[PDB]
Ligand binder design. Sequence first.
Ligand SMILES: Nc1ncnc2c1ncn2[C@@H]1O[C@H](CSCC[C@H](N)C(=O)O)[C@@H](O)[C@H]1O
Ligand SMILES: N=c1sc2cccc3c2n1CCC3
Length: 272
Amino acid sequence: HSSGLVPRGSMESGFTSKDTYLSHFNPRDYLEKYYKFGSRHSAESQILKHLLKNLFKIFCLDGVKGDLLIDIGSGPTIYQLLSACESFKEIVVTDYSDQNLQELEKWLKAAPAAFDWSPVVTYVCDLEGNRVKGPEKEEKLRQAVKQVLKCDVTQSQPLGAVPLPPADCVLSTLCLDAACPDLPTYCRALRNLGSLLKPGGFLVIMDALKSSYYMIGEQKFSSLPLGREAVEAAVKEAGYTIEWFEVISQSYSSTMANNEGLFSLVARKLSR
Ligand SMILES: Nc1ncnc2c1ncn2[C@@H]1O[C@H](CSCC[C@H](N)C(=O)O)[C@@H](O)[C@H]1O
Ligand SMILES: N=c1sc2cccc3c2n1CCC3
C-alpha cells in the first residue's frame, strides 16, 4: 500500500514478498506489457528477439540437448521453450504463481481465450530455417511439455515432493532476479536447481543486470540489482563451471525497468 514509493510487498523486508506473486502478479498484463512481440520495434521487442536468438543458438547450434529440460519460473510464457523442444524430448514447466500455471495450462490445451504466441512462434520458425510453419511448431512444443508444476527456488527441493528423473538441462529466464532478495539466497537458489540436474547437466540462465525493480503496468516488483561479476561469482559458488557468458547493453523501456542490460550464460554442474 506504498503507491510506487517502493515495490509491492517490500515495505517491511526491502524486497517483494512471494505472496505478492500469488496476489498482484497479473499473467495477462505481464504478457501484454512484455510479450505482444514487445511492440513495434520497442525495447521489449528487441529484448525478446535477442532472447529468442540466444535460445536458438544454445539449443539448435550448440551442444545443449538431452531427454529432460526443466524450465524454472516460466511465468505465463512459452517463448523460452520454442527452440528447446528441438533438442529435448521432454520439458517440464514450473512457476511459484498459481495464476501463471493456469495461463500455461490454457495455452497447453489451446484454449481459444489463451494468449496468442503466433508472431513469436513464426519468428522462431524463421530463425530455425522455415523447415515447418508456426502451427506445426506450437503442437511440437505442446506435446513436449509433460508437466506443469508448482515451484519455489528458495526451497532445498524446488519442486516439492514431485519425483522427476535428473534433468539434462535447467532453464531459467527473468526469474532469479525477481525471486532472490539477496546474493546468499540467489547463490542458494542456484544450488537448489542443481538438485534437479544430472552430474554435468546444463544450467541456462538469462536475466537482467543492475535492475532493482520491474513494472507490470503501474505495479512495481523487486529485482535483485546485481552485476555481471556478482552473477558469475554466485554461479561458480553454487557448484557450476561457466561455458559461456554474454552481456548485452540493451535495457527495457525507461518506464518498465531501470536495468543496465541483460546476461545469458550456459554453465555445467560440477564434480563435487
Ligand atoms: N521463489 C520463487 N520460486 C519460483 N518462481 C518464482 C519465485 N518468485 C517469483 N517467481 C516467478 O518468477 C517469475 C518472474 S517473470 C519471468 C517469466 C518468464 N520466465 C519470462 O521469461 O518472462 C514469475 O512468474 C514469478 O511467479
Ligand atoms: N520478468 C521480468 S521483465 C524484467 C525487466 C527488468 C528486470 C527484471 C525483469 N523481470 C524479472 C527480473 C527483473
